[PDB]
Amino acid sequence: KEVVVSETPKRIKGLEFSALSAADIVAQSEVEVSTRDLFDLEKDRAPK
Amino acid sequence: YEYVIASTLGPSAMRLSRCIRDNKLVSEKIINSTALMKEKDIRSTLASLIRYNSVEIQEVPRTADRSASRAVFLFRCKETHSYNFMRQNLEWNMANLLFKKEKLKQENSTLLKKANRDDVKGRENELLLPSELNQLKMVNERELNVFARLSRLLSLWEVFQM
Amino acid sequence: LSIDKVLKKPNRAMEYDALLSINVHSNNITSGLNRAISTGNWSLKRFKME
Amino acid sequence: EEALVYSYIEASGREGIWSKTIKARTNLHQHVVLKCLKSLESQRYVKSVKSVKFPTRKIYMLYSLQPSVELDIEFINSLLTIVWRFISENTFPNGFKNNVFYAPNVKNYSTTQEILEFITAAQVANVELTPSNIRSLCEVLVYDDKLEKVTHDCYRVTLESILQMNKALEDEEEFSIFNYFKMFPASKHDKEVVYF
Amino acid sequence: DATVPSGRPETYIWRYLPAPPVCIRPSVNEDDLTVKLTEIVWTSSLIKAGLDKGISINNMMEHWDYLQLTVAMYINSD
Amino acid sequence: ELDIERVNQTLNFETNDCKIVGSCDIFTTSRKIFAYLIAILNASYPDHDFSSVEPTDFVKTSLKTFISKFENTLYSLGRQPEEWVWEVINSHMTLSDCVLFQYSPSNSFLEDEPGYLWNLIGFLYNRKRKRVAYLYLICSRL
């Protein structure tokens, strides 16, 4: 019925440093910021 | 190279790309003398042509630092920067096209495995349903249409290899 | 720069007393003395000290 | 103060002067020179002509009546076509394009000192009809590749521009950009921009 | 070491710019970073609308040196 | 007046590598109004003729939509726009029942000014009071 879920306690062993691609920036994104309008002022200054 | 620009970026983009080529250090005061379009149409189709390496921009530093406030810009037309970009814009498009070929054959693998095993000879009925031989028809059409576009592109690509 | 904003404008024959725009800027004498003592900041544009 | 602005018009001499380029050397009172030119307009010396250059700026010049160039009327898109059609007529009789050609003994070309009389023969209601710029008005047609240059001072129509009239079609010549068709949206297309 | 697909040297030019989370820059009063991001967007809009309406090369470069100035102030601001 | 001087002290400032200069003014001195605004443009900039571009782009938009992004750009310039301004320009002009215009053509006359970045020009025509405000914001670079 349900799947055997397993977890191991883990630990950081290193940091790796690189720049991001143009595809790494989009892959972590949630919205594409396209307007300079922070708030629409007609709906009680809500974040646009 | 002048007609791949003319086919895609419009015929007016062909006009500037040669007018910049012979004058070879031309400015926009000299463009609209030696071209015959409206100036915002000149400043648009030139703007959609600096995005590719078809022209460079030669700045003048009228002040001490290289400020763009009061400075006029000149327009070269380098051969090899404009060609090596067009060499690999095609080469990427040539490789993208095979990427979508192989991705399409690999996601239709259970069709193609059925298309090789059950119907080695019996393909008059496929030993199957007609709801997928039409779907197989639009796979192997696109599988031959992609190599059609490959050979069409490959003639454009091999020019800049010489 | 506000005493010429009436001279180069129409109603040429309608003169003005030039003493009705003094209180437009007289609240900068008060508010600039009071702010510089209260804040302690010393912003003198002419003398160049900060 | 009214004499130095006369020499500054004479510093321009032929075209004219814009009123905020006065302050490049004068930097006088902005309103004294503002009303001086209104009385100088009433003096019947200077006049307010419009810019041959980038427009919407007050251009002043004394009574010289001497502008330059006509700020892109879009009628000129039609006149060079019948220029292009006429210079094509000297190459071959155009009924064969639907294909007889000759050796380099016929004169397929026509020099610019023949069409400039023909454009006055088939006259247009413009103001100049002048030479020494029709020789550059066909230079856009050696940039548009509708005619090529020949014999260092003359021009003749290329073969490829004749093909604007629209058989086993050839295996993707690049040079027939005009007759390659389109496709209702599928997935396996390639565009030039996509490597951006 | 370009074995990693983000190895390539053209990943060090700002084509795309990540907008940071609002946890990184809150609003108590807009933040310093929030007012910088909108300015970058505004300049980009001036540039993208300018490349199609037709703007001169003298002020295309004026905006595009200004867009580079803002992102330079976005990271360092000194 | 004093309040007009305050709201003009609002709209004239300069941040790190930008210089915004604009103001509002109200004075009494759609076929007949096409010439009534180009005189305001001529007096506003006495170096460019504005009798030339007669069929211009007056985007007859809603004033609420205009003051929306007029407030958004003051958020966008680190100003924290102060609300009493919009009553003060109301208090001289009766902002509610009036129509707005905007000179925004394809290529405005400031593109040739060096250091130009963007503008925001607002006309606010009044009928019962004939009070046209010329709200203008010119962002430059120095």
From Swiss-Prot, chain A:
Compartment(s): Nucleus
Highest taxon above the source species: Eukaryota
Coiled coil: none
Subunit structure comment from the entry: Component of the RNA polymerase III (Pol III) complex consisting of 17 subunits.
Similarity comment: Belongs to the RNA polymerase beta' chain family.
Additional observations: Present with 6020 molecules/cell in log phase SD medium.
Function: DNA-dependent RNA polymerase catalyzes the transcription of DNA into RNA using the four ribonucleoside triphosphates as substrates. Largest and catalytic core component of RNA polymerase III which synthesizes small RNAs, such as 5S rRNA and tRNAs. Forms the polymerase active center together with the second largest subunit. A single-stranded DNA template strand of the promoter is positioned within the central active site cleft of Pol III.
Protein's recorded name: DNA-directed RNA polymerase III subunit RPC1
Source species: Saccharomyces cerevisiae (strain ATCC 204508 / S288c) (Baker's yeast)
Curated annotation (Swiss-Prot), chain B:
Subcellular location: Cytoplasm; Nucleus
Gene: RPC82
From-to range in the entire protein, with total length: 492 to 653 of 654
Protein's name according to its UniProt entry: DNA-directed RNA polymerase III subunit RPC3
Protein family according to the UniProt entry: Belongs to the eukaryotic RPC3/POLR3C RNA polymerase subunit family.
Assembly notes: Component of the RNA polymerase III (Pol III) complex consisting of 17 subunits.
Additional facts recorded: Present with 2520 molecules/cell in log phase SD medium.
Domain of life: Eukaryota
Span list, region Leucine-zipper: 90-111
Function: DNA-dependent RNA polymerase catalyzes the transcription of DNA into RNA using the four ribonucleoside triphosphates as substrates. Specific core component of RNA polymerase III which synthesizes small RNAs, such as 5S rRNA and tRNAs.
From Swiss-Prot, chain C:
Subcellular localization: Nucleus
Disulfides per UniProt: none
Known role: DNA-dependent RNA polymerase catalyzes the transcription of DNA into RNA using the four ribonucleoside triphosphates as substrates. Second largest core component of RNA polymerase III which synthesizes small RNAs, such as 5S rRNA and tRNAs. Proposed to contribute to the polymerase catalytic activity and forms the polymerase active center together with the largest subunit. Pol III is composed of mobile elements and RPC2 is part of the core element with the central large cleft and probably a clamp element that moves to open and close the cleft.
Quaternary assembly: Component of the RNA polymerase III (Pol III) complex consisting of 17 subunits.
Misc. remarks from the entry: Present with 1950 molecules/cell in log phase SD medium.
Similarity remark: Belongs to the RNA polymerase beta chain family.
Protein name, entry field: DNA-directed RNA polymerase III subunit RPC2
The organism of origin for this protein: Saccharomyces cerevisiae (strain ATCC 204508 / S288c)
Gene: RET1
Swiss-Prot record, chain F:
PTM info: Phosphorylated by PKA in a TORC1-dependent manner. Phosphorylation at PKA consensus sites RRxS/T decreases upon rapamycin treatment.
One Pfam family recorded for the sequence: Maf1
Protein's cellular compartments: Cytoplasm; Nucleus
Key word Phosphoprotein present: yes
Gene Ontology CC, one term: cytoplasm
Disulfide bonds: none
Keywords on record: Cytoplasm, Nucleus, Phosphoprotein, Repressor, Transcription, Transcription regulation
Gene3D superfamilies (UniProt xref): Repressor of RNA polymerase III transcription Maf1
Main location: cytoplasm
Gene Ontology annotations of biological process type: negative regulation of transcription by RNA polymerase III
GO MF, any single term: RNA polymerase III core binding
Family matches, as InterPro entries: Maf1, Maf1_sf
Biological role stated in the UniProt entry: Mediator of diverse signals that repress RNA polymerase III transcription. Inhibits the de novo assembly of TFIIIB onto DNA.
Family: Belongs to the MAF1 family.
PANTHER family, alphabetized: REPRESSOR OF RNA POLYMERASE III TRANSCRIPTION MAF1, REPRESSOR OF RNA POLYMERASE III TRANSCRIPTION MAF1 HOMOLOG
Note: Present with 1720 molecules/cell in log phase SD medium.
Name this protein carries in UniProt: Repressor of RNA polymerase III transcription MAF1
Species name: Saccharomyces cerevisiae (strain ATCC 204508 / S288c)
